[PDB]
Amino acid sequence: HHWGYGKHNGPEHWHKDFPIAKGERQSPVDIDTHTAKYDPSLKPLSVSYDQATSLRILNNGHAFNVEFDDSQDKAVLKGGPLDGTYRLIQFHFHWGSLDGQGSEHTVDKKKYAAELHLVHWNTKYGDVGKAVQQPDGLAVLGIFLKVGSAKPGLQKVVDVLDSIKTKGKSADFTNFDPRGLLPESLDYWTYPGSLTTPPLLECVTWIVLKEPISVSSEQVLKFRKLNFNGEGEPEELMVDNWRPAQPLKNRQIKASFK
Ligand SMILES: NS(=O)(=O)c1ccc(C(=O)NCc2cccc(F)c2F)cc1
Ligand SMILES: [Hg+2]
Ligand SMILES: [Zn+2]
Incomplete structure (x- = not known):
């Protein structure tokens, strides 16, 4: 019925309902660090999250989103390859069933345990709905998660997963x-x-950070205990909610560093 990540409604089937799946600028992609162009004109990112107002966390099937109040320029992203101000609307993760898979983007074919996506929308468009209809409507900050030492800042998220187990x-x-x-x-x-x-x-300008953050094995384990299904339905563990790398086509990956 609806799309998913299973054998019968996974990424390989999406194109049937969403023809754009075989488009020209599809994500994620493999970042080949040896062919990425160091661009001296890229400005440093400006991440101003001091006034960020998180509101709730929800399991939407697919993943868990932490939503923020984007009624005003509270948490924004500017700089880098961006033009204008982008407001943070939500963040979510993609993870795997095993530590060797989970990320959507890969670096030199290397997959990480998970990937954090901080989704922002261009304020010049007034609302997210309009922004998605534009080639520069969204900016997603992608951060790789590597299993190692626990990330303290992630623990609040991990503690609440129990209450949003199902869709x-x-x-x-x-x-x-x-x-x-x-x-x-x-x-x-x-x-x-x-x-x-x-x-x-x-509609996305992807900004993938070079440095991954580390999370403990116990932290990643808790992600894996979530359910794709809603209460009262057969239990399907929410794991491997990631899309395989897509062809780069006529695109150039630029790097802010040499
Ligand atoms: N993993 S990621 O960072 O690329 C990503 C970020 C945001 C969204 C999203 O907001 N989807 C809902 C959505 C999007 C557009 C139009 C809609 F209607 C809608 F519901 C989806 C994927
Ligand atoms: Hg668009
Ligand atoms: Zn995502």
């Missing part, structure tokens, strides 16, 4: 600081792409 569940999630999920360095790669889930709109 449709949500819980109040206020006062969460997104800054706790950032690596030390903001060096990044960038390329024009798309949403990695249906509708797969090609």
Whole structure:
């Protein structure tokens, strides 16, 4: 019926309902570090999340989103390859059933345990709905998660997963600081792409950070205990909610570092 990540409604089937799946600037892609162009004109990212107002966390089937109040320029992203101000609307993760898979983007074919996506929308468009209809409507900050030492800033997220085990569940999630999920360095790669889930709109400027953050095995394990299904339905563990790398086509991956 609806799309998913299973054998019968997974990524290989999406093109039937969303023709854009075989488009020209689809994501994710493999970042070949030896062919990525170091661009001296790329400016440093400006991540201002000091006034971020998280509101709730919900399991929407597919993944879990932490939503933010984007009624005003509270948490924004500017700089880098971006033009204008982009407001943070939500963040979510993609992870695997095993530590050796989970990320959507790969670096030199290397997959990480998971990938964090901080989704922002261009303010010049007034609302997210309009922004998705534009080639530069969204900017997603992608951060790789590697299994190692626990990330303290991620623990609040992990503790609440129990209350949103199944599809449709949500819980109040206020006062969460997104800054706790950032690596030390903001060096990044960038390329024009798309949403990695249906509708797969090609409205995204991807900003993938070079430095991954580390999370403990216990932290990643809790992600894996979530359910794709809603209460009262057969249990399907929410794992491997990632889309395989797509062809780069006529695109150039630029790097903010040499
Ligand atoms: N993993 S990712 O960062 O690429 C990604 C980010 C956001 C969304 C999203 O907001 N989807 C819902 C959505 C999007 C467009 C139009 C809609 F109607 C809608 F519901 C999907 C994928
Ligand atoms: Hg678009
Ligand atoms: Zn995502």
